[PDB]
Amino acid sequence: DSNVVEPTEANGKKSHVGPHLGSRMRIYEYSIEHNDAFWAEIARRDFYWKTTWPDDQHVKSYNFDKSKGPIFVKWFEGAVTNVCYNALDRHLPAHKDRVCFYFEGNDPSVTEAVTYGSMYTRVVELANVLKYQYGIAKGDRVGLYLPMIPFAAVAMLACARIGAVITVIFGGFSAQALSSRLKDAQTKLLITADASARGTKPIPLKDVADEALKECEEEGMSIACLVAENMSCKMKEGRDTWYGDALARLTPEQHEECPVEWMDAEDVLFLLYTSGSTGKPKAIVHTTAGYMVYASTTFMYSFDYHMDDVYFCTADIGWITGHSYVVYGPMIHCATSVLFEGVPNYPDYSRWWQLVEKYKVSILYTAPTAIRSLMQAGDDYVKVGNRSTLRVLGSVGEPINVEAWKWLRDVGGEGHCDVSDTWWQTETGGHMITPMPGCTPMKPGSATLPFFGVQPVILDPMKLHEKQGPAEGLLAIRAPWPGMARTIYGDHARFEKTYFGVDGYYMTGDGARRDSDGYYWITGRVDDVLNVSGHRIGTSEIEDAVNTHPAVVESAVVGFPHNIKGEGIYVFLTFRQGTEVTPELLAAVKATVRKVIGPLATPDVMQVARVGLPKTRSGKIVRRILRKVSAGQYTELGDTSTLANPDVVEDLIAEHQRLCS
Ligand SMILES: Nc1ncnc2c1ncn2[C@@H]1O[C@H](COP(=O)(O)O)[C@@H](O)[C@H]1O
Ligand SMILES: [Cl-]
Fold it and tell me: How far apart (Å, rounded) are the C-alpha atoms in residues 45 and 153?
């Protein structure tokens, strides 16, 4: 069609796959019909195994059909490996002088080029601190509450080295949100830093961790804390240790060697707390062999990473993108990457382009919310940067519309880049539907074709049968892939209910359209999870937080279209009778949400429902009406006949118009 953008000739010549779509389709066909042999060949070619699996013809066992028994997936059972060894040791000594991370702080005077050789030293030191000073054993859980600094990667890899299970808590979560994750994961140890900075905003980390640890102790836990020096904290005697002091306890040889814990294929690698449609965030569990292979193989092909490329992903390790596509995937393929602690607008909106030109970045993986913010700020901030080295631009985490896609390619990338809009989720471990540079014609707004080994389908929402050819409906995956999450920590029943409700399929929770070229167009979540600036958050978590303010009776949270964030957070709420409502009181309710969850959950609009929320006669809030009001779609309010209090509708519209929103 006329909306197709051809891959660049240069990227076709460079591609690991080939210069034409036929090259990709040749491998894809093999990856489906010889699925086991394909993954066995990739696994053997691209990774170190202490022990290999016994049969190339049979590297997966699984059940996707609840009627036949428990849902499960296993990949490479019988194999033995280690993620840290594949990310680091095996690249030495050959690549000891290769830069692993070009680190830059929020402050542009803070920089460091960290080689693979230096990463090895840093990781063996920390691994020995964990083993010998903290007694961290295989399978123990370790919480990370860290900024995007080299130590964050060191910490993830040291835990992998000794077979500990990490759970990374995004540094923007509050103390209450951190404490909840440490309690649910039963962490023995929290690794944090003194502090960070984001633009002009100080980011307390250890001071926040102090309140989280106090809450955990009141609950009967005992959690030690190791604190990296990044930027004078109150350190609790016996509980808290500065990393410099822990390092001083090491013997000389503990700076040089640390034994690798050789892991079985299905040993747990990390727990990542993720918001769902109902209830509190649940920990998605990823194991070792399948996830290692999948994250790294998607990194290689979706970005066409070669050794002469320099890579920059703008995502935080607190989310799956930073796990798969900042630390694990890139280092396993010996990438040279940019590691950036700061924000795109500090000191000003040229900052990311200054990084691109300084480090000769050729592959940039970022998010549509960031792109849309750069678009609003003006093209002069981009055009002062030399972007000649860019050849691949990637987008993750939300739909991108045609205007932002075109701006990314033709302004940001000067019209000499391919764009990889990658669709995937925390639960899928790595990319699932994505272009590949040089071989895949792009349609702006489409994720295009499935990754090797991936079989998506479109299910009819009513019959729940597959639809063939051009079709719209529920996006599902009909067969296993190595990167799939294996369970929800402590709740396999919820895992089966949420993702395997239709026998034979992994259900994504997204809607999608497949077109006549087999390209997929993801249309968004079909449940009650919001996508706020790329971050998924459940409406009921925000509602509960709002309801903890003592003046609040009732609240309902819905998403609404937002020209930068994609989806904003809209709060309808009612206060107790006789409350005097001021900008300050609404500010206090907002601050309560930021105390309970964190700034990522800040309401964008708070509308006071003078007469109450629209409810049925059984007392259930009719959220459909609230979604339509918050979006300004007054003609599509829908049925009011089931409301017990139909008189509230007029006020809700009039207020919304007043706020505008
Ligand atoms: N490329 C994309 N296009 C559209 N939506 C996306 C894309 N990538 C991720 N998403 C959305 O983000 C969700 C995954 O969020 P997360 O688990 O944080 O990665 C998906 O279920 C989609 O709703
Ligand atoms: Cl859920």
Answer: 25
Tokens at 508, concatenated: 């994504």
Of 288, 298, 290, give the one whose Cα is nearest residue 480: 290
Please report the domains of the chain, with CATH numbers, ordered by start residue: 9-82+269-273+287-525 (3.40.50.12780), 87-261 (3.40.50.980), 529-659 (3.30.300.30)
Which experimental approach was used here? Answer: X-ray
Backbone angles phi, psi at 31, to 5 degrees: -65, -20
Query: For residues 654 and 632, what is the distance between their CA atoms, to the nearest angstrom?
Result: 11
Q: Please check whether residue 109 is in contact with residue 92, taking contact to mean a CB–CB distance below 8 angstroms.
A: no
Closest residue by Cα to residue 371 from 355, 387, 352: 352
Task: Give φ, ψ of 512 to 5 degrees.
Answer: -160, 160
Which residues are annotated as part of the binding site for CoA? 198, 201, 316, 594
Annotated binding site for AMP: which residue ranges? 397, 421-422, 425-426, 510, 525, 531, 536
Here the tokens at position 56 are 């190339």
399 Cβ closer than 6 Å to some ligand 1 atom = yes
26 sits in which H/E element? helix 21-33
Q: What is the C-alpha to C-alpha distance for residues 611 and 575, in angstroms, rounded to an integer?
A: 10
Query: Are residues 128 and 254 in contact, defined by beta-carbon separation less than 8 angstroms?
Result: yes
Nearest CA to ligand 1 atom 15: 425
For ion ligand 2, residues whose CB falls within 5 Å: 276-278, 498
- 539, 559 Cβ separation under 8 angstroms: yes
Host H or E run for residue 161: helix 150-162
**Gap between the terminal Cα atoms of the chain:** 38
The residue whose CA is least distant from atom 20 of ligand 1 is 425
This PDB structure is determined at a resolution in Å of 1.6
3-state secondary structure 208-252: HHHHHHHHHHHCCCCCEEEEECCCCCCCCCCCEEEHHHHHHHCCH
Q: Please tell me the distance from the alpha carbon of residue 105 to that of residue 103, in angstroms, as a whole number.
A: 7
- CA atoms of 148 and 314, how far apart (whole Å): 10
Q: What token pair was written down for 541?
A: 């978590």
Ligand 1: does its nearest atom lie under 6 Å from the Cβ of 95?
A: no
Please, which residues have CB within 8 angstroms of residue 287's CB and are 6 or more apart in sequence?
Answer: 265, 266, 267, 268, 269, 486
Please say whether the beta carbons of 168 and 157 come within 8 A.
no
Which residues make Cβ contacts (< 8 Å) with residue 89, sequence separation at least 6? 120, 260
Crossing angle (nearest 10°) for helices 116-128 and 150-162: 60
d(CA 438, CA 453): 20
Rounded to whole angstroms, how far apart are CA atoms 335 and 307? 7
What would you report as the CA-atom Rg of the chain, rounded to the nearest whole angstrom? 25
For tokens 């086991």, the residue is 36
Q: Quote the distance between the C-alpha of residue 249 and its chain's center.
A: 36
Ligand 1 pocket, mutate which of 402, 531, 565 (most atoms under 8 A from CB): 531
Of 125, 146, 123, 127, which Cα lies nearest the Cα of 135? Answer: 127
Give φ, ψ of 61 to 5 degrees: -135, 145
Pairing of strands 487-488, 165-168: unpaired
- Ligand 1 atom with the smallest distance to the CA of 422 is 1
